[PDB]
Design an enzyme around this catalytic site. Sequence first.
Site, PDB file in Angstrom:
ATOM      1  N   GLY A  11       0.457  -1.594  -0.259  1.00  0.00           N
ATOM      2  CA  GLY A  11      -0.201  -0.014   0.072  1.00  0.00           C
ATOM      3  C   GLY A  11       0.966   0.984  -0.026  1.00  0.00           C
ATOM      4  N   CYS A 127      -2.386  10.890  11.575  1.00  0.00           N
ATOM      5  CA  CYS A 127      -1.982  12.107   9.948  1.00  0.00           C
ATOM      6  C   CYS A 127      -1.888  13.035  10.084  1.00  0.00           C
ATOM      7  CB  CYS A 127      -1.764  11.883   8.848  1.00  0.00           C
ATOM      8  SG  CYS A 127      -3.419  11.197   7.673  1.00  0.00           S
ATOM      9  N   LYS A 222     -11.686  12.314  15.687  1.00  0.00           N
ATOM     10  CA  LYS A 222      -9.794  11.685  16.392  1.00  0.00           C
ATOM     11  C   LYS A 222      -9.406  12.505  15.678  1.00  0.00           C
ATOM     12  CE  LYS A 222     -10.083   9.230  12.581  1.00  0.00           C
ATOM     13  NZ  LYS A 222      -9.736   8.416  11.024  1.00  0.00           N
ATOM     14  N   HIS A 251      -0.160  17.292   3.913  1.00  0.00           N
ATOM     15  CA  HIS A 251      -0.720  17.834   4.685  1.00  0.00           C
ATOM     16  C   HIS A 251      -1.171  18.987   4.770  1.00  0.00           C
ATOM     17  CE1 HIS A 251      -3.457  13.622   3.868  1.00  0.00           C
ATOM     18  NE2 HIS A 251      -2.961  13.434   5.484  1.00  0.00           N
ATOM     19  N   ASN A 324       2.124  13.398   4.708  1.00  0.00           N
ATOM     20  CA  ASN A 324       1.157  12.899   5.449  1.00  0.00           C
ATOM     21  C   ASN A 324       1.583  10.954   5.544  1.00  0.00           C
ATOM     22  OD1 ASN A 324       1.007  13.669   2.560  1.00  0.00           O
ATOM     23  ND2 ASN A 324      -0.950  11.663   3.548  1.00  0.00           N
TER      24      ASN A 324
HETATM   25  N1  LIG Z   1      -2.157   7.002   3.576  1.00  0.00           N
HETATM   26  C1  LIG Z   1      -2.332   7.727   4.533  1.00  0.00           C
HETATM   27  O1  LIG Z   1      -1.413   8.790   5.243  1.00  0.00           O
HETATM   28  C2  LIG Z   1      -2.386   7.130   6.579  1.00  0.00           C
HETATM   29  C3  LIG Z   1      -1.946   7.746   7.401  1.00  0.00           C
HETATM   30  C4  LIG Z   1      -1.948   7.665   8.870  1.00  0.00           C
HETATM   31  C5  LIG Z   1      -2.726   6.090   8.710  1.00  0.00           C
HETATM   32  N2  LIG Z   1      -3.028   5.230   7.417  1.00  0.00           N
HETATM   33  C6  LIG Z   1      -3.754   4.121   8.039  1.00  0.00           C
HETATM   34  O2  LIG Z   1      -2.946   3.723   7.218  1.00  0.00           O
HETATM   35  C7  LIG Z   1      -3.575   1.837   6.545  1.00  0.00           C
HETATM   36  C8  LIG Z   1      -3.299   1.907   5.205  1.00  0.00           C
HETATM   37  O3  LIG Z   1      -3.369   3.238   4.324  1.00  0.00           O
HETATM   38  P1  LIG Z   1      -2.480   3.133   2.829  1.00  0.00           P
HETATM   39  O4  LIG Z   1      -2.595   4.282   2.741  1.00  0.00           O
HETATM   40  O5  LIG Z   1      -1.535   2.531   2.545  1.00  0.00           O
HETATM   41  O6  LIG Z   1      -4.020   2.133   2.074  1.00  0.00           O
HETATM   42  P2  LIG Z   1      -3.354   1.359   1.069  1.00  0.00           P
HETATM   43  O7  LIG Z   1      -2.953   2.215  -0.338  1.00  0.00           O
HETATM   44  O8  LIG Z   1      -4.900   0.955   0.233  1.00  0.00           O
HETATM   45  O9  LIG Z   1      -2.557   0.214   1.183  1.00  0.00           O
HETATM   46  C9  LIG Z   1      -4.174  -0.751   2.377  1.00  0.00           C
HETATM   47  C10 LIG Z   1      -2.574  -2.285   2.421  1.00  0.00           C
HETATM   48  O10 LIG Z   1      -3.559  -3.269   2.737  1.00  0.00           O
HETATM   49  C11 LIG Z   1      -3.514  -4.283   2.532  1.00  0.00           C
HETATM   50  N3  LIG Z   1      -4.506  -4.861   2.893  1.00  0.00           N
HETATM   51  C12 LIG Z   1      -6.269  -5.109   2.933  1.00  0.00           C
HETATM   52  N4  LIG Z   1      -6.638  -5.703   3.688  1.00  0.00           N
HETATM   53  C13 LIG Z   1      -5.140  -6.762   4.225  1.00  0.00           C
HETATM   54  C14 LIG Z   1      -5.755  -7.928   4.332  1.00  0.00           C
HETATM   55  N5  LIG Z   1      -6.613  -8.519   4.821  1.00  0.00           N
HETATM   56  N6  LIG Z   1      -4.891  -8.798   4.667  1.00  0.00           N
HETATM   57  C15 LIG Z   1      -3.733  -8.356   4.667  1.00  0.00           C
HETATM   58  N7  LIG Z   1      -3.267  -7.056   4.300  1.00  0.00           N
HETATM   59  C16 LIG Z   1      -4.347  -6.537   3.574  1.00  0.00           C
HETATM   60  C17 LIG Z   1      -3.171  -4.327   1.430  1.00  0.00           C
HETATM   61  O11 LIG Z   1      -2.719  -5.332   0.524  1.00  0.00           O
HETATM   62  P3  LIG Z   1      -2.297  -5.444  -0.579  1.00  0.00           P
HETATM   63  O12 LIG Z   1      -2.040  -5.334  -2.313  1.00  0.00           O
HETATM   64  O13 LIG Z   1      -2.807  -7.776  -0.906  1.00  0.00           O
HETATM   65  O14 LIG Z   1      -4.400  -5.844  -0.481  1.00  0.00           O
HETATM   66  C18 LIG Z   1      -2.209  -2.777   1.038  1.00  0.00           C
HETATM   67  O15 LIG Z   1      -1.309  -3.444   0.795  1.00  0.00           O
HETATM   68  C19 LIG Z   1      -5.173   2.979   6.869  1.00  0.00           C
HETATM   69  O16 LIG Z   1      -5.627   2.066   7.853  1.00  0.00           O
HETATM   70  C20 LIG Z   1      -4.860   4.136   7.005  1.00  0.00           C
HETATM   71  O17 LIG Z   1      -5.826   4.813   8.115  1.00  0.00           O
HETATM   72  C21 LIG Z   1      -2.273   5.594   6.461  1.00  0.00           C
END
Ligand SMILES: NC(=O)c1ccc[n+]([C@@H]2O[C@H](COP(=O)([O-])OP(=O)(O)OC[C@H]3O[C@@H](n4cnc5c(N)ncnc54)[C@H](OP(=O)(O)O)[C@@H]3O)[C@@H](O)[C@H]2O)c1
Lengths: 357, 359
Positions: A11, A127, A222, A251, A324
């Site tokens: 991700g 974030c 949050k 951000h 972020n």
């Molecule tokens: N983006 C930000 O700026 C940010 C900041 C702070 C916190 N976060 C938090 O971090 C988390 C992920 O964010 P992201 O932006 O990286 O999302 P993302 O780009 O959509 O990535 C999601 C990741 O989770 C994996 N995943 C989904 N379902 C799964 C499962 N059932 N078992 C194991 N792995 C699974 C996916 O792997 P696959 O490719 O195999 O589907 C992918 O690598 C979120 O909960 C978010 O709240 C994000």
Amino acid sequence: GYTVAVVGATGAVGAQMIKMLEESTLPIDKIRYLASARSAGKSLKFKDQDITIEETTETAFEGVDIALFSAGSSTSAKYAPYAVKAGVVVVDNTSYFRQNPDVPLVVPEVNAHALDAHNGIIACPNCSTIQMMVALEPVRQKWGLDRIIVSTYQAVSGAGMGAILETQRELREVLNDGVKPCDLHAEILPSGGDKKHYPIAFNALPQIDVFTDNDYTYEEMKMTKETKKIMEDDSIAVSATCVRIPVLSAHSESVYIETKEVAPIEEVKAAIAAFPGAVLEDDVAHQIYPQAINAVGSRDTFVGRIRKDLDAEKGIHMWVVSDNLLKGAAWNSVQIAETLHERGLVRPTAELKFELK
Amino acid sequence: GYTVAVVGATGAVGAQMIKMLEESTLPIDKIRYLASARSAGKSLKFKDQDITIEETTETAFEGVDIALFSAGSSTSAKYAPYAVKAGVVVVDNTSYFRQNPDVPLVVPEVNAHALDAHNGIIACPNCSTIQMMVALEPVRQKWGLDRIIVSTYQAVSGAGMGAILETQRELREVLNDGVKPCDLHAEILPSGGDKKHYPIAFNALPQIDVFTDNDYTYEEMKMTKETKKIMEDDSIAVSATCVRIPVLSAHSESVYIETKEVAPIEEVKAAIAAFPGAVLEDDVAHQIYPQAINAVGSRDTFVGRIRKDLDAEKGIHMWVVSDNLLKGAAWNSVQIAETLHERGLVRPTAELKFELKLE
Ligand SMILES: NC(=O)c1ccc[n+]([C@@H]2O[C@H](COP(=O)([O-])OP(=O)(O)OC[C@H]3O[C@@H](n4cnc5c(N)ncnc54)[C@H](OP(=O)(O)O)[C@@H]3O)[C@@H](O)[C@H]2O)c1
Ligand SMILES: NC(=O)c1ccc[n+]([C@@H]2O[C@H](COP(=O)([O-])OP(=O)(O)OC[C@H]3O[C@@H](n4cnc5c(N)ncnc54)[C@H](OP(=O)(O)O)[C@@H]3O)[C@@H](O)[C@H]2O)c1
Ligand code: NA
């Protein structure tokens, strides 16, 4: 050294966690990449080494010392308790464990002391919250904090990899195909889980996450509740408006505060500049202020536009910008892991305080 | 009917001034398009008619009944007093005359009464100010206003036609050519007049206009000072942060207010909905809120995300969106002209109260 697992390696945050770990000081003997079943078997780099992506299961955590979770609240809720049972120390980026009293909610520069009494799970704050805490803690230390009002200018990468691609497609359809922004088709933003979807191209969407019962979104709430926990002060009034804008990374936040004691602006500037993780970018005579585009790729939080309110004696306005995916996510997590190493806190937890699902 | 002159007819606001006049009820016998020497001799449409663009001069206003100025502060400073001397009634979009005590600063839904004692020049407020006044006036009427804190999300058309083109070019360079946003060359934004220029593509620039000696920009201070004049209350505390974002049209604003008396949110929503020029778009259960892309092309000002502060009893947050070239500029001007016609206020001013700069 340690065995380090990255859960959600594919991700948006996962890719940055890999980059942050590559540049980390952490003694890593073995690295493992974990994701969903559809990513299992695929290869992903660690420096100049090939790592095969594994499927995240209940029994995939044996031998792991540190697990960095960034795969959505659902994945952390299901698998993180099994990791703790296996002897792992979990650093979670999701919202799931953040408000659990047995879980420290940590920004290393602000409340590293909270790490000492951890029970196997350390939660990374949202974030948008993190960068605000870095900017405001040096102010709170010297003059206190009565209230915070924040309006955010949030990047689409906050909503994940899909949201970046949606934003890029939409913008190309307007600029190249001549489609009116209001006529665009959207499938992710403002919130993937919610019922309706709206274009972000040439737009400002005043919704991040879903709405709560009080007509604030979960994102705004949050910011309120995490601030209270991080700064260990429930008396701090916090209200937020969280808005998505057409920015890919970093951000930005318009932050208003009222201090307990009058805080001279030049002393405020100096205090922020002296605070670890915070960089003063404030020279209006030469148009110097934090900018999203300049913050991209940096671990630092940039603070500027610092000025007193025109009427409120103890009121101060400022502009806060940070990447972020770094300080807002992947860097905060890796920094926590490094702080855990420093304090000899990477070890199994005897008492299991989290229910297995 | 009237002879109407559009000064700055070729610009971003000018193009919308033409559209608004085409859709106006104003009896127009003659239309004249005025601009700089650069555009003089060119042709623009008024409905089906071909209108030759004229260079703006001190002698260009003979026989003109209404002149709509949107050609920069220096143009209004130089030529508007000569128009008044000629017998014209001027509606000015620039900042030049806004704080002059002999000049009404008008949003028709808020303070149309100020038009009666005009001295030949009526000033339109800043685009960011106008939409906030429409949203907040119904609230002030019932519960009063103690303070306002506003953070803006402003469109690039606010900085003119060149700024729109620069934004489109930059975005095309990033999305089509793979240029890094940091490597973009900028010439206009954040402020054309200022020393340094920055990319807007995938950025948020916390500078609109130039900085004043108190570290607020002129944009932020105009919101403060214009509010006090429009609402005729110097005791209203107003502080602003004004930010440019990658949007072509329509400003958005995060507005915080504290009222004098507790204002129930359901009544606040009702009061805004009932107020002319303001449309309530507030149904969070169905994710309904004002959006820049939906406001584009509409004369209305859209208000949503209305909710009380989590701690301050008299505190209220809201989200305000309007087309900055319409209600923020061209429509406000045309609406003023129509109100002047309604009240029989389109006629020469006998006494000149404004300095002639080309003597
Ligand atoms: N983006 C930000 O700026 C940010 C900041 C702070 C916190 N976060 C938090 O971090 C988390 C992920 O964010 P992201 O932006 O990286 O999302 P993302 O780009 O959509 O990535 C999601 C990741 O989770 C994996 N995943 C989904 N379902 C799964 C499962 N059932 N078992 C194991 N792995 C699974 C996916 O792997 P696959 O490719 O195999 O589907 C992918 O690598 C979120 O909960 C978010 O709240 C994000
Ligand atoms: N854009 C907004 O949302 C907004 C809102 C409220 C108020 N305003 C005000 O409106 C004014 C301009 O609006 P804009 O954004 O449309 O700017 P713009 O796109 O840059 O257009 C400027 C116009 O001014 C004319 N002009 C320049 N110098 C002149 C001169 N020496 N004599 C006669 N005409 C001259 C130009 O004519 P040429 O083509 O011949 O150069 C052009 O038509 C500014 O003062 C601004 O403060 C703008
Ligand atoms: Na520092």
